[PDB]
């Protein structure tokens, strides 16, 4: 008999309403035919539920526990906490899918934030409910929150680290915990912290940036872009970064950024500006969650992480272990070629995007070359995806940004080819499959060189037109720069309020803009024609890093000239 046909039994006296165990069978936590069993601290957890149930009562957003049972598991029999199954998704999966549908326009902004504030009101109602029984949860996080598909309701499902009010917590999650939690006891105001940091996790998308922790709240970048740009000019939200102080940021600040004493409790937090203003009907919110949970789940994003100095060092550490293993003759030849392929993908991503210094890039690139040398001195199914990835890179539209990428890809295919035929020298001979693979590599190398020659020819052409364009600017560049700087010194900005209230302020700008436009009145046609040529060229040159650093410096020279010229071309329409 497998354990799927072994019966279950009770340990103590089950709670009122508990089901009959006679017909139940088995398919951490296991599923029972729907019920759920959680396999010392377990018995204290059941007692916590019972205390809550008799002091505060049962709760729709709290787990429904039936009692302690003995279940067949792992060639043994275990004590198991029996509870109703919350059929749906976990908090991380739900909030990711919710935000995803929002961005795709499946729901509008009032539906998204309304649902968010609905979820907040429920969680804070739970922490308020536990506070009635004098019980602190101490471990509220996306893993311990499950949404029910049928009702669209958030349900917290764990009490294993609970404690009474004023005593030390049984445990905590270091990534979400309050500053005072676990030091020096626990409190309701520590649970409120957890609720917010949990929400902050799923709103900002902290799962795409492992270098930051939800309990650190929000960073404020106000004098600089609080965002990053993509390929086509669309701003992209940075997890944990805020560009302006709003009700949302105040909510985080007034809770995650204050001491326990100054921190609001569950009822106070629900009266906050963020949770008071901008809410929707509960059933509308519940309906949105239903539709989300009955739809397609947004998967955990893989390889979405930005290449930072920290992460680049991590990738560097991975390569050095291969170097070390090679010195001790235990080098894994298979995983070192596949790891190197992720390095190139990481390096390409780091080039087109920003952040990491170029000194660290050349250093990281040298480390890759070093690993190649060690591999070479050390002397198919694994290198196959590497060729497929590169071949798809060859069938795309290329830019000047891709030249450094195509060079390294060529080096990789060249190294793969060398490795294969070198192993045939004093090892297994070249097979019919390896042979056909060698020529597929060889064909890609040819295409790689043909395409790389074209790009550099086009680059030299673009570099020629670039210098020609900079030359024309010499007659108006510095004069127009001084004028626009004098104008920008007046701090031009559109003000809030009625036209009456902003009348004097607006006509002051029109006067300033007029003066500036009179000082450059003799270059107004040159600057108009200048941007007609420079903008399409700036598009061709891009914003990514290029090998020719002189070209990069000149490209930014043009970008600054273009910025001056195009703004003056639009200055009348903007402020007059």
């Amino acid at each position: 008999k497998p354990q799927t046909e072994l019966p279950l039994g009770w340990k103590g006296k089950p709670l009122s309403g508990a089901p009959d165990l006679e017909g139940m069978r088995v398919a951490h936590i296991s599923i029972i035919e729907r019920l759920v069993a959680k396999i010392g601290h377990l018995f204290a957890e059941l007692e916590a539920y019972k205390h809550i149930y008799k002091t505060a009562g049962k709760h729709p957003n709290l787990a429904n526990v039936h009692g302690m049972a003995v279940v067949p598991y792992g060639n043994r029999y275990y004590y198991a906490l029996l509870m109703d199954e919350v059929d749906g998704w976990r908090c991380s999966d739900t909030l990711r899918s919710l935000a995803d549908s929002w961005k795709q326009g499946k729901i509008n902004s009032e539906a998204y934030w309304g649902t968010i504030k609905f979820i907040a009101h429920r969680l804070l109602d739970v922490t308020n409910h536990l506070a009635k029984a004098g019980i602190v949860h101490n471990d509220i996080k996306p893993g311990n929150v499950v949404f029910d598909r049928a009702s669209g309701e958030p349900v917290v499902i764990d009490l294993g680290l609970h404690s009474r009010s004023g005593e030390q917590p049984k445990g905590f999650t270091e990534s979400f915990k309050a500053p005072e939690l676990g030091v020096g006891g626990a409190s309701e105001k520590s649970d409120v912290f957890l609720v917010v940091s949990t929400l902050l996790h799923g709103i900002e998308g902290f799962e795409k940036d492992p270098e930051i922790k939800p309990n650190q709240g929000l960073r404020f970048i106000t004098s600089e872009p609080a965002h990053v740009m993509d390929e086509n000019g669309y701003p992209i939200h940075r997890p944990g970064i805020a560009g302006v102080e709003t009700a949302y940021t105040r909510f985080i600040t007034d809770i995650l950024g204050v001491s326990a004493d100054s921190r609001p409790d569950s009822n106070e937090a629900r009266l906050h500006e963020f949770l008071s203003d901008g809410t929707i009907d509960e059933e509308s919110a519940k309906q949105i969650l239903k539709d989300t949970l009955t739809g397609e789940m947004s998967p955990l994003p893989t390889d979405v992480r930005r290449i930072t100095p920290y992460y680049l060092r991590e990738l560097s550490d991975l390569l050095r272990t291969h170097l070390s293993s090679a010195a001790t003759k235990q080098l894994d030849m298979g995983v070192v070629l596949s790891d190197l392929d992720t390095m190139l993908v990481a390096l390409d991503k780091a080039e087109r995007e920003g952040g990491v210094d170029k000194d660290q890039l050349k250093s990281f690139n040298s480390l890759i070359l070093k690993t190649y040398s060690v591999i070479g001195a050390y002397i198919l199914s694994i290198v196959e995806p590497s060729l497929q990835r590169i071949q798809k890179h060859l069938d795309q539209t290329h830019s000047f940004s891709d030249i450094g990428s195509l060079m390294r890809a060529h080096k990789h295919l060249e190294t793969l080819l060398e490795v294969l035929v070198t192993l045939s020298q004093q090892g297994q001979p070249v097979s019919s499959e390896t042979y056909s693979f060698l020529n597929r590599l060889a064909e890609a190398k040819v295409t790689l060189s043909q395409q790389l020659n074209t790009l550099q020819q086009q680059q030299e052409s673009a570099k020629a037109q670039l210098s020609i364009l900079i030359n024309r600017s010499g007659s108006w560049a510095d004069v127009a720069r001084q004028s626009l700087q004098r104008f920008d010194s007046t701090r031009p900005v559109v003000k809030f309020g009625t036209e009456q209230y902003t009348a004097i302020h607006r006509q002051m700008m029109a006067a300033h803009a007029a003066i500036t436009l009179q000082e450059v009145s003799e270059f107004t046609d040159d600057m108009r024609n200048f941007t007609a040529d420079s903008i399409p060229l700036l598009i061709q040159l891009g914003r990514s890093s290029l090998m020719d650093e002189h070209l990069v410096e000149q490209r930014e020279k043009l970008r600054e000239l273009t910025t001056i010229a195009e703004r003056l071309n639009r200055l009348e329409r903007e402020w007059m």
Binding site: I221, I241, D277
Partner: protein, 358 residues
Amino acid sequence: VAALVVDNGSGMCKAGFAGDDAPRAVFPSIVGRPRSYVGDEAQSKRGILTLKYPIEHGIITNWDDMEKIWHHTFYNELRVAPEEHPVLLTEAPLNPKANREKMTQIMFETFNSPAMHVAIQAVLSLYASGRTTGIVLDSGDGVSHTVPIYEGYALPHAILRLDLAGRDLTDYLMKILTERGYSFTTTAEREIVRDIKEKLCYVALDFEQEMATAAASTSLEKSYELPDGQVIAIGNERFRCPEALFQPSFLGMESCGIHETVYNSIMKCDVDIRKDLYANTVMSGGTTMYPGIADRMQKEITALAPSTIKTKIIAPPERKYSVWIGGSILASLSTFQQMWISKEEYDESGPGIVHRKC
């Protein structure tokens, strides 16, 4: 005595006296119940209220709340006595007859108006253009309409409704501003975003070209100062937001843009009158107030229409009040005082009279 002109919309209510250039009272169509206030005060006291919109997509859905707005309009905004002034109300195209009778009943049995009349909103906008023939693009806060009108008669079979308007655009601007680290969520902040939309947005004549300009440099970026003093800066969101009017896919909708909706309305009319519609395309509503929308509208329709067709777009300087202005004009005519539904007529016929007189 001066007749009253009241224009009830999804987001804003316009009221005043017939014979004036602009409505003297313009306030949000919001009613706030406990857990009662109307308009601005309802917004200022939102902390103890639940705000609702009586009008949805140009159609009244909450008659109890609609009464409070009219009561607020009369005794608080206009500060007049409804029983001493005839009243001209407005209605959306294809407004259900049950709504028309209910509207009639309220003005007579609740506010005791001496006389009333209700007119189609788009038709009043055409009158304010000095036209009896043409197609109107009416676009407000909740609904957009294309209404072909010939010799004073609206053509019901060619009228198209498009659930795409101002509050959708404001909502859209709220989402795409988060990508810049700006998180506006509350109703108060929604109004601020609406303010940003009305001051920094514009319609690009060539969308893909402007996107290239926005990506290449910082030339298109403009700064805005929040009421608390905070300064934000936005870029391509300026023209990406009203672009949704032409590309509803930006809003998750699989429907035609305003330019293609106008074309489809014209193409449902008789062949021999399409020329007159093309030459007299009138724009109405606050949503049509974006800088550059007329030129873009001209461009897009020209691409759809046959080559021989002449395309002319009329866009009045304050077409946010065109409906009201058209109403003020109509109620000022003494040739029109023949059309009012008198209190006597109502007591004789009942609510069902509105189908015969209006």
